[PDB]
Design a protein around this ligand. Structure first.
Ligand SMILES: *Cc1cc2c(cc1C)nc1c(=O)[nH]c(=O)nc-1n2C[C@H](O)[C@H](O)[C@H](O)COP(=O)(O)OP(=O)(O)OC[C@H]1O[C@@H](n2cnc3c(N)ncnc32)[C@H](O)[C@@H]1O
Ligand SMILES: *Cc1cc2c(cc1C)nc1c(=O)[nH]c(=O)nc-1n2C[C@H](O)[C@H](O)[C@H](O)COP(=O)(O)OP(=O)(O)OC[C@H]1O[C@@H](n2cnc3c(N)ncnc32)[C@H](O)[C@@H]1O
Ligand SMILES: *Cc1cc2c(cc1C)nc1c(=O)[nH]c(=O)nc-1n2C[C@H](O)[C@H](O)[C@H](O)COP(=O)(O)OP(=O)(O)OC[C@H]1O[C@@H](n2cnc3c(N)ncnc32)[C@H](O)[C@@H]1O
Lengths: 577, 577, 85, 85
């Protein structure tokens, strides 16, 4: 470790790695710090789902996810346990226990909000859905020219899609994907379009998909190395970044305080450029700990003078979920082209189709798969091959249906016991609402309570806003109930429900972007530069100032690219030495 | 990859790494294969609990464990789900679904039995308890001389303890450890001894323990390298080892068939020496797939001619579990030396002790910790400091109490919601029974059904034997109920119960050791050499032929050391070239 | 009314506890009953007054579409009959 | 019915029940029959069902009925956790 870099990046998530990819490639001397450690194998920051074993045991990956989601703010527990033995020590009050945050109103929380501290951040476990935002969901990059604004976003999203290896073809030969997508397509009478979820992923074989991650964006290997002898990059895991040091004028950052969690020692690192990509919660924490905004319980009597909008106007998406069990009608349609005679397992049983018949509803490739499954596995009552890939269907957010949708199979919510219902029948439904930014919705940090890293304890003061946001959330629930019904009935134990607020992990607006600090109630400009500061930049979903239902990471990435362009235009890399 | 090695080792668990440590150091050209991949960070095969983040969030590590325990044999699911919508496709029978094994009698299973496929094997997540076996639990290494047998085991265990970094001091300054251990020590009236669980672990700080693993035993880095320029070692992850090739005489292994799971290609590897350390289940699978024992459902009419005892006499431990909530009596004793005046949080409140007072029940270090906690945290009603390390107590197996005990805090069974009971109050109780080896207790492999790696599907035919084993298991349950009561009442939701058979993961005897193949109904001799074969060795708990309650890994390691000594005595390493 | 043979696997019994080798007819289960072609919720009430001792008391009329015919070929006459009854 | 065994944490004045009831086509294959060997607690032939909801109109309507309850209930309030559709 040197004491001086061109660029320091806090956080090795996919957004931190966007800055590294851009800036390391442009010849800057870059250091990157992560509070978390190298986890994912020799491919640093790679997707943990990319083992042969997980893709043969996909029901198990839910545990990997749960094992790295550490709750942001847990309120004081008030469950009454009055069946203790009389000899057992027993509380007289509901005191602060087990990491609970006594600042937290349990009724104004995002109880589901969690953070992930490992190299690669949440991109080591994520679902990889990377849709673009349409205009209605998207911040403006150009103020008064929608065509120019469209062009800018098209260019940035196109590059971001390249970085993530986003595709829409990886599941095209899945019978289950087809069954669902075709049925929905035919039922919405031309008024909603269904397509594959855009996924950051590359199929390697019929039964293996290499899911993208931070590592895809930037491989995180120290440089110079043999593959890049003129690049300069160092990654430092297990380093808690604690404060950036402002000058008096709030016009420059002069240092970054770091804490080595292995030795325990503390150091300060100097850079020309400071980039904070610690996540929506932890970017905000690092800034409040550095004297931006206001530490402690908010008060209107005394609003902060430095970045007053920091930690206000926070947004989280409402998320509704169910699973369905495929209809008899749909299962029967799989085998609609087959002539079926006799009883399975008996000598006279046969399943045949006519290749190329114009009356066939499916192409030969489908009918081949189905016939062979049915004949080779007469003990099995379903016409779907065992290793058929999962459905990956969406109808994207539109004005007439202002929510994102995923109709799919997610590694999450497999739970702890084996499904009695055949997996080939089960489809997940997740609809994601957009939330109006409101000043009263806050992420703030205690002036007394600290988290496990001795940093000010994050506390939410959040309610879904009462008007459009709430009306849409409930219409969205109804929409999932109506749409899912076309595919199958609900799976018992996965009935339609709102998920714990924040479990969706799509928090935005904690350090939001706009054109004008005061007029747009914001923290960074469209270069992601913190207002007033020459050399401090923020990256991540905390920048998104709008109400959005689609998954935010691709949008956050696109903003990060634009930010890197500004850095390239205004800072000179040091001589290679 | 070369096609020729001195020694090939199948499996990179702690036992495979014992063979590597011994044989790589002795100058053999060694190759090691694992079906699993490099997981744990840059320290290959290291303990996953050794991140700063897990040790600050120990409640989360249960998920890491569950996420790599893949069930060995799951019977056909027979749960009736009759609340499906009438449109949903519905089974007419309880057909084979979702990876269920149709060979498996659900009432003669080890339903809890699971396997872990990652580099380092189960030592990437294990509890690290490494007790020695006393004579009553231990196989004989010397037949007719108990003193010589003791000497041999003492020498081997001492070396094994060095490899694992086993210690009994890492928790000595824990108030909770002390509270529990002292109370039990005083109550058993000199007739049972309590000590710290021997743990393969090194404390790095008051709040961090470096748990041992495969990596501790052998760092798994390819050699030659800068630290070992004259050693030769290669590790090949994501390689399924499928068969060893016997000669006609069953006197030599001539090849190992391997399947590269990345390219898909298959190869054969030649070695002078073949060592199988794939685990108790998978060693047995590899051997049956190679023509040892009998493939298919067992029959007495036609017993196997090659290694007839393979997969018979299997043992698994009965395991009983509860948690307790510390008694008022014990909590009060923590602060017994304190003069306490007034009410917490009031101006006049004070907590004081007299340093060195002979009437004090605790030393100054304890009273300091307690006073400062009580005065600095008057909002907290407990006298135990927040970061006090967990209890790690045992009374080891003896004739009058023939079970192992762990009275402790395990990363497992934290479950999915936050404890409402303060963590400092909670103690885990796990008592582990010994199981008589019986011929009727079998691990066998289907001749038709295959697992996710296209290998013969493991199937259990197991019941706990009816006489001593069952009587002891129930006495053991009672013993946990009696002993735990001295510490506190049961924690609701963790009441005394038998765990799912095999969840304990202490399976032995699947390829058991003895002196004489026929007389001792066994598969390997005391050098772990397979009977009749010059160059095939088995390592792991599958070798242990006895009824044991203590955790088997240290014993398996000790046997592996003895096996390596035989290899060193009988095989010449190749010239370094 | 008809409870099928219970097939829940309880494998956490103590080794000393007596344990079934099969899923035998237990606890009033009906071995004739296919559990997958049942009305598992169907129940009966044996007390004076029958189920009207506990019922919800909702007494709607059936419209024609739900209702058996009392008069075969005259919907008006059929309506009159049902109205009177 | 369906109050269950623990106290509602949600105020009772807020809670409303929704029960929608489908019509089922009569089909010859749907039977109530009685065992010639097994008897009930009154030593009478044991009732046994052979029943499935018929596949066509009856099933289509049941699922449309579920949807209808979801749409209609939404006008009043969101679902009560633990009493989902
Ligand atoms: C958990 C999850 C997330 C997820 C998802 C499914 C799951 C189970 N599915 C997604 C999807 O389909 N599409 C999508 O767009 N997002 C999805 N997500 C969310 C997504 O993973 C996140 O939006 C994305 O990872 C955000 O990226 P970002 O780079 O901004 O942040 P990060 O991944 O959380 O990484 C931040 C890193 O910063 C380190 N850190 C935190 N604090 C510090 C300090 N103080 N000092 C130094 N380093 C710090 C963290 O350790 C982390 O690695
Ligand atoms: C899961 C677990 C285990 C455990 C424990 C707690 C948990 C949660 N606590 C323990 C304790 O406190 N004390 C103790 O003695 N044991 C404890 N255990 C069990 C312990 O981890 C195991 O006894 C030990 O790891 C056994 O070691 P071994 O080296 O013999 O086997 P392994 O760890 O299972 O590793 C085997 C490797 O082989 C690879 N494999 C399997 N099949 C193949 C094939 N066909 N080809 C190539 N490689 C193969 C596996 O991937 C694995 O890595
Ligand atoms: C349990 C229930 C029923 C119910 C309801 C809510 C509940 C919780 N809500 C209803 C509603 O809102 N609207 C409506 O129309 N019905 C509702 N029900 C169903 C309703 O109670 C029944 O349809 C009605 O009670 C049927 O009346 P019926 O007179 O035909 O039959 P019964 O009430 O079941 O009484 C029969 C009596 O016969 C005796 N019995 C049975 N077997 C024998 C033999 N072998 N020998 C002599 N006596 C016998 C029974 O003991 C019973 O009392």
């Amino acid at each position: 470790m040197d004491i001086k870099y061109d660029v320091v990046i806090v956080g090795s998530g996919p957004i931190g790695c966007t800055y590294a990819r851009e800036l390391v490639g442009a010849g800057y001397k870059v250091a990157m710090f992560d509070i978390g450690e190298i986890d994912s194998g020799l491919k640093i920051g790679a997707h943990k789902k990319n083992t042969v074993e997980y893709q043969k045991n996909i029901d198990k990956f839910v545990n990997v996810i749960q094992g790295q989601l550490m709750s942001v703010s847990v309120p004081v527990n008030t469950l009454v346990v009055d069946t203790l033995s009389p000899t057992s020590w027993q509380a007289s009050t509901f005191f602060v226990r087990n990491g609970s945050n006594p600042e937290q109103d349990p009724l104004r929380n995002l109880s589901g909000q969690a953070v992930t501290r490992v190299v690669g951040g949440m991109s080591t476990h994520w679902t990889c859905a990377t849709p673009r935002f349409d205009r209605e969901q998207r911040p403006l990059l150009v103020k008064d020219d929608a065509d120019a604004d469209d062009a800018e976003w098209d260019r940035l999203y196109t590059k971001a899609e390249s970085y993530f290896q986003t595709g829409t073809d990886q599941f095209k030969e899945s019978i289950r994907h087809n069954l669902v997508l075709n049925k929905l397509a035919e039922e919405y009478k031309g008024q909603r379009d269904f397509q594959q979820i855009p996924l950051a992923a590359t199929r390697r074989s019929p039964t293996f998909v290499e899911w993208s991650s931070a590592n895809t964006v930037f491989d995180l290997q120290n440089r110079p190395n043999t593959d890049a002898p003129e690049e300069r990059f160092n990654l430092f895991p297990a380093v808690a970044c604690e404060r950036v040091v402002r000058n008096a004028l709030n016009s420059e950052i002069e240092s970054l305080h770091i804490h080595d969690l292995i030795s325990g020692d503390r150091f300060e690192i100097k850079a020309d450029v400071y980039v904070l990509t610690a996540g929506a919660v932890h970017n905000t924490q690092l800034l409040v700990n550095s004297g931006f905004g206001q530490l402690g319980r908010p008060n209107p009597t005394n609003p902060p003078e430095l970045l007053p909008s920091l930690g206000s106007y926070i947004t989280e998406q409402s998320l509704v979920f169910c699973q369905t069990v495929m209809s008899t009608e749909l299962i029967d349609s799989v085998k609609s082209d087959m002539t079926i005679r006799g009883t399975p397992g008996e000598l006279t049983y046969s399943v045949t189709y006519t290749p190329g018949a114009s009356t066939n509803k499916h192409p030969d490739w489908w009918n081949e798969k189905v016939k062979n499954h049915m004949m080779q596995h007469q003990e099995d009552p379903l016409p779907i091959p065992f290793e058929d890939p999962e459905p990956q269907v969406t109808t994207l957010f539109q004005p007439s249906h202002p929510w994102h949708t995923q109709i799919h199979r997610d590694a999450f919510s497999y739970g702890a016991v084996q499904q009695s219902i055949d997996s080939r029948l089960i489809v997940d439904w997740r609809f994601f609402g957009r939330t109006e930014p409101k000043e009263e919705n806050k992420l703030w940090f205690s002036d007394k309570i600290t988290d496990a890293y001795n940093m000010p304890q994050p506390t939410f003061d959040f309610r879904f806003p009462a008007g459009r946001t709430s009306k849409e959330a409930e219409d969205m629930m109804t929409d999932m109930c109506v749409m899912s019904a076309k595919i199958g009935g609900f799976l018992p134990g996965s009935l339609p429900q709102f998920m714990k607020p924040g479990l969706v992990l799509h928090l935005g607006g904690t350090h939001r972007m706009g054109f004008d600090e005061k007029e747009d109630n914001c923290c960074v400009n469209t270069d992601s530069r913190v207002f007033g500061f020459k050399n401090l930049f923020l990256g991540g979903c905390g920048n998104i100032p709008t109400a959005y239902g689609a998954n935010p990471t691709l949008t956050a990435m696109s903003l990060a690219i634009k930010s890197c362009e500004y850095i390239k235009q205004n800072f000179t890399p040091s001589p290679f030495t």
